[PDB]
Scaffold this active site. Structure first.
Site, PDB file in Angstrom:
ATOM      1  N   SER A 194      16.018 -36.366  75.362  1.00  0.00           N
ATOM      2  CA  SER A 194      15.798 -35.683  76.607  1.00  0.00           C
ATOM      3  C   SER A 194      16.653 -36.394  77.661  1.00  0.00           C
ATOM      4  O   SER A 194      16.757 -37.629  77.674  1.00  0.00           O
ATOM      5  CB  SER A 194      14.305 -35.646  76.956  1.00  0.00           C
ATOM      6  OG  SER A 194      13.831 -36.930  77.249  1.00  0.00           O
TER       7      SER A 194
ATOM      8  N   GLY B 225      13.799 -38.607  71.919  1.00  0.00           N
ATOM      9  CA  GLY B 225      14.621 -39.611  72.561  1.00  0.00           C
ATOM     10  C   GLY B 225      15.923 -39.093  73.138  1.00  0.00           C
ATOM     11  O   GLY B 225      16.725 -39.896  73.630  1.00  0.00           O
TER      12      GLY B 225
ATOM     13  N   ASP C 118      11.096 -30.920  86.153  1.00  0.00           N
ATOM     14  CA  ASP C 118      11.238 -32.073  85.236  1.00  0.00           C
ATOM     15  C   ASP C 118      12.607 -32.796  85.416  1.00  0.00           C
ATOM     16  O   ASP C 118      13.305 -33.143  84.436  1.00  0.00           O
ATOM     17  CB  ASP C 118      11.056 -31.600  83.781  1.00  0.00           C
ATOM     18  CG  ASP C 118      10.632 -32.710  82.849  1.00  0.00           C
ATOM     19  OD1 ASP C 118      10.290 -33.832  83.313  1.00  0.00           O
ATOM     20  OD2 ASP C 118      10.643 -32.452  81.628  1.00  0.00           O
TER      21      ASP C 118
ATOM     22  N   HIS D 178       9.469 -36.582  82.943  1.00  0.00           N
ATOM     23  CA  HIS D 178       8.510 -37.066  81.932  1.00  0.00           C
ATOM     24  C   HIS D 178       8.932 -38.370  81.302  1.00  0.00           C
ATOM     25  O   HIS D 178       8.111 -39.030  80.684  1.00  0.00           O
ATOM     26  CB  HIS D 178       8.185 -36.023  80.857  1.00  0.00           C
ATOM     27  CG  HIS D 178       9.301 -35.714  79.885  1.00  0.00           C
ATOM     28  ND1 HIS D 178      10.068 -34.567  79.964  1.00  0.00           N
ATOM     29  CD2 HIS D 178       9.772 -36.397  78.817  1.00  0.00           C
ATOM     30  CE1 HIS D 178      10.958 -34.559  78.992  1.00  0.00           C
ATOM     31  NE2 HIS D 178      10.799 -35.661  78.280  1.00  0.00           N
TER      32      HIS D 178
END
Ligand SMILES: CC[C@@H]([NH2+][C@@H](C)CC(N)=O)c1ccc(Cl)c(Oc2ccccc2)c1F
Ligand SMILES: CC[C@@H]([NH2+][C@@H](C)CC(N)=O)c1ccc(Cl)c(Oc2ccccc2)c1F
Lengths: 642, 645
Positions: B153, B151, B95, B71
């Site tokens: 991830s 911020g 992901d 993402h």
């Protein structure tokens, strides 16, 4: 860097289309060089900084835009950066000389009641004028519809300029009318002094007046000049935000000008009968304000400060002084609104790099830079102060942390030290240092009208403004050669404060100074109406309405929140009263809600939520009458940034 | 635009876990490196701070691989010392993406402890203690508001020995407050590394002996809707071919009979034909309206254009995946030119030309010359219906045969034939099937997104956004088929393909209730099969939340529902349900936008504040929050939700 032209809105039987002239990489480069050789066309420009993008309109050879978008910045130009010709913070208005290429609009003289607004997306929104600076949209629209379009033209049917768009007027997040800067405010601005002199104290006038003194700390603004005024036989009151500064003037004025002044603070009171008194704004407010006829001259020092006590304090002076028989108020500061940090002769500025043993906001401090001597490192949070102080101690550097809540004897005052502090330093401690190391960020509060159910007071970390940079840097260089080390080279625009600070004023009014919301309002009105001071959005009627509804507070809860010294002690204690009487737990069990700790065994259910003052962890119910009252207050017409 | 290393988070390698950050780059550095994809800098440490033009996040090196989230990074390359490094792994389902660690980076190594005391490292170099609940969840020892995690991830969760347990991908919030963290377990990274880096999906699968689901990834005009059903038929199998568009569905069927010698079954609202043949073409919509899979009917089901994330397609594919095995099919083929993680690659037959400011017709800040469109057959993509009409006006006034197209118009307005310029939205690509000399693309579109705004419940915002790789390739694909084709564009950008918003899941329940007589629970089973099937577009798991909301929207007014249905606007169930709640209270709708036109006739009787259930646009009326359904939905907002971080 500089503001940069990134496009334009061409005007045509009125219509418009947009042209984008630069991309992201071009905008960034040009903003840093300040050098822009592109062709310039049209009457409306699309401008942008690194952060924000908005509009500018040329009128009478000047490209005008909003202060809240452009600050004091240059505009990139064919021959390098272009210094603002006009800067009027009071009106939210700046102007650069328009470069060759730009066509100006002519002022709407006659004056339409039906106007058309041009947005950054080339819409032509019709508008019916109401006041001098306000007009209503014939078709209500969402607020995001108008974002990015501040400083765009407001046009009459013939296409002459009536004004520039500055702010959307919202009811529950829906834009319904618009505030603009009228074209006559621009003309007034083009005719106001090249450079007024504010480095010299006023002569005392025969009748009431308000004066501006702009000069640095230790120029005698707060020592030499009250003494000269006293020699001429006037009674003078000097107001200061700091207890430490205020107490210091006592022994200093005795030694230096043979005056043993009255000193007035929350912690210590000295009454000598001298014709000079030094007080904090806070003690001034607790003494009920302006005494009857005791002072001819009231000096409002550090008037740049935008804490709630200073703003309410100065507002109280501006509402009372004339009636009390004063002849002169003096708004004194080194960093007035609109200022920018200039190079200081006695201070070497040096960027930090990534070389050094001590990490610091993404950069490094070399141990050699701070090993011996006396140094001040500014950090944004208490947490960071403790971390860094502990790292330094681990390495054998003598180091100490200081922030709101510690006693200032954590000092030392003499001998080697690294003091790691928040801006609480700037009011708790007077001394100067061999160097200052600045993180270039601060913590601020902002209000968010989030309708969930009411409003929210967010704590947020932001890049420092020019007042913070200049004040932080000024802790080295007072009669010593200093060094300022920094993490980043910029500074946001100075002289603006958040609507949460207005909210704080009402809150302190109720909490400490026995003011009704109406009394508080009248005083803030006085501050707002006086030019040259810090600027905000006019939300007086909205905040007055809110606090007006918060009756029968629990005195014991209030006493506790005040004693604990955290922010919004009224709002916090009011929520607690509501919770205890509703027999419901508070929004969470953070330290903020400790007044309620003993009731915890019996408190249950959803929290009757009035507003958000941090994380809400309990379930909430909106059934409380007070919540319904505050939700109804949210229907107020609110100016919003754009 | 490459991903760029803008800094690092250094972890202590002794004592208790502590961190600090270093910045290695400013904004300008970042932009230039993203453009060139070339990164001089020495890279150090194991946790990198990374940025695109539009966002910043983390990446953690583990076992020679620098890992981050899909993402955040999409499919983008990483700017490295000898130029752009392409992703070695692009696992959209988990992901998870990875590039080979450049020279100079150290790598963490997995946990051998199997410990349950976990520490999350954030982009501000904090070390947050976390307790492990499952393979992929861990609860915070002390809740925090969601925004301190944003911020971060792609950052690691460490065990007390300082080895890698996983990487942070999402915060699990209760009403805007994080209680737990979703992470990608270091095993999923372990698997990936030991398995192949390339898989082939370019050829129709063989018909297996027993039930299988397979992916078919191949271009348009490789006969995916025609050649491959024809080819399976000629081996004596019964084949169902599902497609999102009525036009494409009728186009194929008439092609089949002319070109492959089969008169097929056709099944659409507007045209249904039962010839008894062994191939059937249907819409996903008609398929669902027929009740799904009828037993013994098909051996093979081809779900074509399986990249579509419209609610009818998702629900259609979900129905098939839940039902096909039991209905006795051998094979489900999920076919698309543009699968998740795909990128727009240069096409041989199509010339791609940046649009400039040279020209007489303004277009999204740039210009179109009349030279470019004065004669021939040309297509211009616009994002809104309201700019399609305004642009076609400017064209008509310039001696040009301009015709607008968009949802709510007859497709016969497009000359077949004639020397023309069509100005249209993405409606074109389900409505019309012809191709053009050139395409001109504004590179933006209108999407919907949900905001868990709590004012009082949720909000469905309509917004404009940069196109993804699917929109780009699909929009470009309307020229250059077997002959000259020109693609003109405003922006070279392109978002990651294959992700879709939680609003789409809400549409799924809505459509279930409004069109297909599915209860929310039936809908959940169908969607569950979709999410759980690998290789399909991805979303957040908000199934229990949405099911729980629609489960409470009972006793809708049939009349209003039929009207919101017929008018074809989005969320006809949510719109009709608000209207029903408003009329039974004699209250007015949140505003008098055309969205609420079913209430216009009741205007004289309606008074007071609106009992607001949720937000679907601007709210001009005063609102009250006391309606029980409002309370129910507020109660539903205590559901534990993943949000993007
Ligand atoms: C032009 C209006 C003026 N406000 C009056 C109440 C006068 C005053 N004393 O502020 C004004 C001037 C400048 C600015 Cl940046 C304004 O807008 C903001 C926006 C956000 C924060 C602070 C001020 C403004 F609202
Ligand atoms: C690893 C979780 C996975 N979601 C599952 C429900 C499986 C599925 N079928 O999507 C997942 C994969 C990839 C991404 Cl970009 C995810 O996050 C988002 C975030 C926003 C929009 C869309 C997906 C994601 F949530």
């Amino acid at each position: 860097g500089s503001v940069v032209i990134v496009g334009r809105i061409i005007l045509s039987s009125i219509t418009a289309y947009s042209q984008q002239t630069r991309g992201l990489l071009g905008c960034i480069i040009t903003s840093l060089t300040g050098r822009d050789k592109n062709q310039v066309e049209g009457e409306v420009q699309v401008v942008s900084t690194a952060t924000q993008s908005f509009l500018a309109t040329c009128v009478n050879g000047v490209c005008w835009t909003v202060y809240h978008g452009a600050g004091s910045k240059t505009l990139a130009g064919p021959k390098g950066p272009i210094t603002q010709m006009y800067t009027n913070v009071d009106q939210d208005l700046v102007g650069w000389q328009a470069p060759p290429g730009a066509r100006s609009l002519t002022p709407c003289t006659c004056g339409s009641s039906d106007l058309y607004l041009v947005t950054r997306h080339a819409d032509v929104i019709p508008v019916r004028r109401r006041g001098d600076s306000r007009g209503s949209l014939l078709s209500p629209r969402p607020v995001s519809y108008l974002k990015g379009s501040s400083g765009g033209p407001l046009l009459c049917p013939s296409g002459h300029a009536v004004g520039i768009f500055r702010a959307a007027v919202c009811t529950r997040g829906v834009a319904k009318a618009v505030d603009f800067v009228p074209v006559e405010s621009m003309e007034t601005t083009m005719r106001s002094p090249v450079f007024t002199d504010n480095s010299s104290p006023p002569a005392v006038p025969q009748s009431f007046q308000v004066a501006h003194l702009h000069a640095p700390t230790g120029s005698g603004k707060s020592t030499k000049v009250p003494a000269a005024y006293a020699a001429q036989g006037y009674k003078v009151l000097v107001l200061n935000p700091s207890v430490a500064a205020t107490l210091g003037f006592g022994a200093y004025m005795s030694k230096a000008h043979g005056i043993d002044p009255n000193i007035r603070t929350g912690v210590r009171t000295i009454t000598t009968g001298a014709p000079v008194t030094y007080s904090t704004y806070g003690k001034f407010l607790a003494d009920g304000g302006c005494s009857g006829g005791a002072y001819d001259i009231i000096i409002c020092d550090e008037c740049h400060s935008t804490d709630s006590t200073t703003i309410l304090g100065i507002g109280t002076v501006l509402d009372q002084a004339e009636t009390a028989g004063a002849r002169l108020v003096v708004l004194a500061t080194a960093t007035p609104p609109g200022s920018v940090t200039v190079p200081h002769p006695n201070i070497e500025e040096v960027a930090l790099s990534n070389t050094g043993e001590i990490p610091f906001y993404g950069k490094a401090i070399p141990i050699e830079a701070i090993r011996g001597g006396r140094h001040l490192i500014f950090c944004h949070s208490k947490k960071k102060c403790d971390e860094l102080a502990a790292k330094l101690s681990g390495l054998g550097i003598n180091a100490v942390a200081y922030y709101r809540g510690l006693d200032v004897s954590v000092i030392p005052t003499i001998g080697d030290v690294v003091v790691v502090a928040t801006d609480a330093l700037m009011t708790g401690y007077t001394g100067d240092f061999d160097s200052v190391i600045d993180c270039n960020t601060c913590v601020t509060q902002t209000v968010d009208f989030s309708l969930d159910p009411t409003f929210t007071i967010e704590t947020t970390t932001v890049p420092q403004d020019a007042v913070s940079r200049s004040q932080r840097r000024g802790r080295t260089g007072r009669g010593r050669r200093g060094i300022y080390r920094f993490v980043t080279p910029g500074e946001r625009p100075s002289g603006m404060f958040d609507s949460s600070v207005l909210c704080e004023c009402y809150d302190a009014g109720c909490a400490w100074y026995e003011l009704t919301p109406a009394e508080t309002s009248v005083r803030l009105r006085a501050y707002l109406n006086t030019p040259g001071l810090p600027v905000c959005q006019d939300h007086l009627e909205f905040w007055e309405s809110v606090f007006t509804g918060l009756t029968h507070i629990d005195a014991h809860f209030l006493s506790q929140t005040k004693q604990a010294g955290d922010n919004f002690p009224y709002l916090v204690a009011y929520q607690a009263t509501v919770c205890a009487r509703a027999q419901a737990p508070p929004p969470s069990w953070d330290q903020m809600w400790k007044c309620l700790i003993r009731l915890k065994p019996t408190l249950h259910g959803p929290t009757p939520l009035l507003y958000r003052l941090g994380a809400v962890q309990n379930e909430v119910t909106l059934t409380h009458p007070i919540t319904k009252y505050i939700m109804a207050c949210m229907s107020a017409d609110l100016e919003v940034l754009t």
